């Protein structure tokens, strides 16, 4: 299953971009199609994305009017246009295929490694985490009752210069491929994963995230930059 996203793009104030991704290898119309951005040194915005068999789409709410998300099955691509470009619309735009595997069918996730276009609620996390290697460390992620204490939690590792993975999902799944040295957890309207023995691989920022029914949009957490210190 793979995501290629259109070249990196500079572009003028107040003119719009279409930024497109292709996926191959999989059932197309069986997946949800999500495009999450990142302005450069911050965390995670989710703008919207469409719903399979309907073929609706839907947005977050500072970018209505601005945003038009639409897919070709035909060809497997799903584009993004954002109109109206202010400066604080540079970031690097993200395209996800959300879905369900083929035989045990749970929940699943792959990002696009993102178009870089040149020209706000959150979850909260604390900023910062370490370690030394071996030891355990604990992030938190802390909401209110319409996102973590009514809906399921995901958690996204992000490596340097990299797009978020999914690390956790349904408050404490781990996809193949995860390790069990990380684990999921979540009470009330408070969550939290744990790393045990830790390794200098796990350097990352941390993102907890999960639906909203008041807002009825997607959240993410503020990201704890998790620092393996030598040794
Ligand atoms: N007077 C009116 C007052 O009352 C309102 C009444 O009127 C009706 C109110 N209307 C509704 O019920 C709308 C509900 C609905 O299904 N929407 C369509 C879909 C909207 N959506 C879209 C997207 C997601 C999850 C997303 S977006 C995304 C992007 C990147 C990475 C992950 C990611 N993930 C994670 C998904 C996994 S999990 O599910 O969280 O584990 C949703 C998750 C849950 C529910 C809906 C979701």
């Known amino acids: 299953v793979q995501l290629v996203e259109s070249e990196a793009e500079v572009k003028k104030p107040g003119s719009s971009v279409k930024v497109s991704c292709k996926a191959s290898?999989?059932?197309?119309?069986?997946?949800?199609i999500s495009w999450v951005r990142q302005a450069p040194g911050q965390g995670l915005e989710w703008m919207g994305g469409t719903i399979p068999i309907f073929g609706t789409a839907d947005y977050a709410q500072e970018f209505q009017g601005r945003v038009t998300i639409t897919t070709d099955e035909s060809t497997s691509t799903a584009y993004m246009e954002l109109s109206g470009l202010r400066s604080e619309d540079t970031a690097v735009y993200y395209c996800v295929l959300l879905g369900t595997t083929m035989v045990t069918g749970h929940y699943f996730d792959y990002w696009g490694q993102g178009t870089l276009v040149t020209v706000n609620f959150m979850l909260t996390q604390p900023p910062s985490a370490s370690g030394t290697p071996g030891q355990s460390v604990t992030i938190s992620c802390s909401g209110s009752?319409?996102?973590?204490?009514?809906?399921?939690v995901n958690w996204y590792q992000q490596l340097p210069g990299t797009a978020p993975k999914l690390l956790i999902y349904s408050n404490n799944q781990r996809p193949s491929g995860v390790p069990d040295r990380f684990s999921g957890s979540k009470s009330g309207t408070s969550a939290s994963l744990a790393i045990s023995g830790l390794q200098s691989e796990d350097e990352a920022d941390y993102y907890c995230?999960?639906?909203?029914?008041?807002?009825?949009?997607?959240?993410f957490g503020t990201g704890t930059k998790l620092t393996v210190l030598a040794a």
């Open positions: 290898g999989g059932t197309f119309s069986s997946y949800a």
């Open positions: 995230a999960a639906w909203d029914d008041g807002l009825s949009g997607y959240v």
């Open positions: 009752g319409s996102n973590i204490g009514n809906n399921k």
